[PDB]
Amino acid sequence: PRYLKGWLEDVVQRSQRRPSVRASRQRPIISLKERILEFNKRNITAIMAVYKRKSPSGLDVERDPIEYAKFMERGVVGLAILTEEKYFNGSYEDLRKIASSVSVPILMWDIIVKESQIDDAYNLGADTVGLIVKILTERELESLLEYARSLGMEPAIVIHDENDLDIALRIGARFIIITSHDLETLEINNENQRKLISMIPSNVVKVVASGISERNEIEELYKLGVNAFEIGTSLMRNPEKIKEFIQ
Ligand SMILES: Clc1cc(Cl)c2[nH]nnc2c1
Ligand code: NA
Numbered sequence: 001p002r003y004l005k006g007w008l009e010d011v012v013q014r015s016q017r018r019p020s021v022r023a024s025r026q027r028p029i030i031s032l033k034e035r036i037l038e039f040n041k042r043n044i045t046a047i048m049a050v051y052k053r054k055s056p057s058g059l060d061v062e063r064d065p066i067e068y069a070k071f072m073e074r075g076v077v078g079l080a081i082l083t084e085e086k087y088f089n090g091s092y093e094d095l096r097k098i099a100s101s102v103s104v105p106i107l108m109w110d111i112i113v114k115e116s117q118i119d120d121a122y123n124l125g126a127d128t129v130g131l132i133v134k135i136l137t138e139r140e141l142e143s144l145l146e147y148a149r150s151l152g153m154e155p156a157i158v159i160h161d162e163n164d165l166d167i168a169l170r171i172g173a174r175f176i177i178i179t180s181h182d183l184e185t186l187e188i189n190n191e192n193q194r195k196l197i198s199m200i201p202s203n204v205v206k207v208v209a210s211g212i213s214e215r216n217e218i219e220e221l222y223k224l225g226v227n228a229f230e231i232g233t234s235l236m237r238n239p240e241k242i243k244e245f246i247q
Contacts, residue, residue: 001016001113001135001136001137001140002134002135002136002137004135005184006184007056007087008111008135008183008184010086011084011086011087011111012111012113012135014084014085014086014111015084015110015111015112015113015114015117016113016114018116018117018120020116020119020120021092021096021120021123021124022123023092023096023120023123023124023125024123025099025122025123025124025125026099026100026125027125028152029122029127029128029151029152029153030104030105030127031105031127031128031154032048032077032078032105032106032107032127032128032154032156032175033128033154033156033174033175033205035077035078035104035105036048036077036078036205036207036227036228037205037227039077039228040227044246045218045222045229045245045246046077046227046228046229047075047076047077047228047229047231047242047245047246048076048077048078048079048080048107048207048228048229048230048231049072049076049079049080049231049232049235049239049242050079050080050081050082050109050230050231050232050233050235050236051063051065051068051069051079051080051081051082051090051094051098051236052082052088052089052090052109052232052233052236053082053088053089053090053236054087054088054089055087055088055232055233056087056088056186057186059233059236059237061236061237063236063239065081065094065097065098066097066098066101068239069081069097069098069101069102070101070102071239071242072235072239072242073102073103073104075242075243075246076104076242076246077104077105077228078104078105078106078107078127079098079102079104079105079106079107080106080107080108080109080230080232081094081095081098081099081106081107081108081109081126082094082109082110083095083108083109083110083120083124084109084110084111088109090109090110092120092124095108095121095124095125095126096124096125098125099124099125099126100125105127105128106125106126106127106128107126107127107128107129107130107156108120108121108124108126108128108129109130110129110130111132111135112129112130112131112132112135112136112144113135113136113140114144115144115147117129118144118147118148118151118153118155119151121153122151122152122153127153128148128153128154128155128156128175129148129153129155129156130155130156130157130158130177131144131145131148131155131156131157131158132158132183133157133158133159133160133163133164133167133168134158134160134164134183135183138167138170138171141157141167141168141171142171145157145171145172145173154174154175155175156175156176156177156207157171157173157175157176157177158176158177158179159176159177159178159179159196160178160179160180160181160182160183161192161196162192162195162196162199165196165199165200169200169201169204173204174203174204174205175204175205175207176200176204176205176206176207177206177207177208177209177230178193178196178197178200178206178207178208178209178226179208179209179210180193180208180209180210180211181209181210181211188210188211190210193208193210193221194224197221197224197225197226198224202225205227205228206225206226206227206228207226207227207228207229207230208221208226208228208229208230209230209232211233211234212229212230212231212234212245213231213233213234213241214244215244215245215247218245229245231245
């Protein structure tokens with residue numbers, strides 16, 4: 001990984017030491033990217049709902065992961081499940097349960113720093129993983145992107161600024177998540193969102209993560225050509241809002 005400090009450095013070391021899990025997936029991979037494109041062609045809002053019990057910014061809720069997944073399955077394009085242990089209180093067991101219990105594609109949401117974590121995603125039933133440009137050297141991104149592809153996944157490349165986007169497009173990202181979250185500070189900053197979205201070619205599937213909590217914000221971003229919307233905290237606090245987001 002890159003040289004990092006603070007909580008990210010902690011999670012990066014945690015990830016490097018993380019033992020590979022015993023698991024066996026129960027259906028072939030369903031491309032999350034391609035399901036988003038099918039939602040787009042059908043003119044149906046594509047929401048990727050996030051399951052997380054906590055966040056380093058202060059989320060703290062308890063909700064049964066299967067019930068939440070079953071509830072969301074009816075309306076989402078897919079689910080992102082936290083498996084990061086210390087800051088998000090997630091685990092591989094949440095993914096194993098959800099990915100075996102719902103039919104929609106699943107992104108494993110964690111800090112990936114090594115191939116065996118992508119193995120873990122695959123064996124646990126996830127359909128794809130995110131790789132984070134701020135965390136990974138360009139060489140590690142290239143390598144892990146190639147490795148995910150070799151398993152049948154198209155990973156989401158997570159970018160926050162123009163420097164990250166430069167990298168993601170150079171390595172040939174086909175699926176990008178544009179986050180307003182500064183992973184260091186934890187603050188949501190939207191200053192550069194409009195510019196970043198507009199720099200991504202039309203045939204790259206783009207997803208926005210930004211503390212979204214209102215249908216209006218989705219409508220605004222969709223006008224810019226955004227394909228899908230990752231929504232975590234507002235749905236963890238009130239899952240019933242999925243209806244405002246997809247109606
Ligand atoms: Cl896997 C992953 C990692 C990060 Cl930092 C993300 N930020 N927004 N969506 C994400 C998915
Ligand atoms: Na560095």
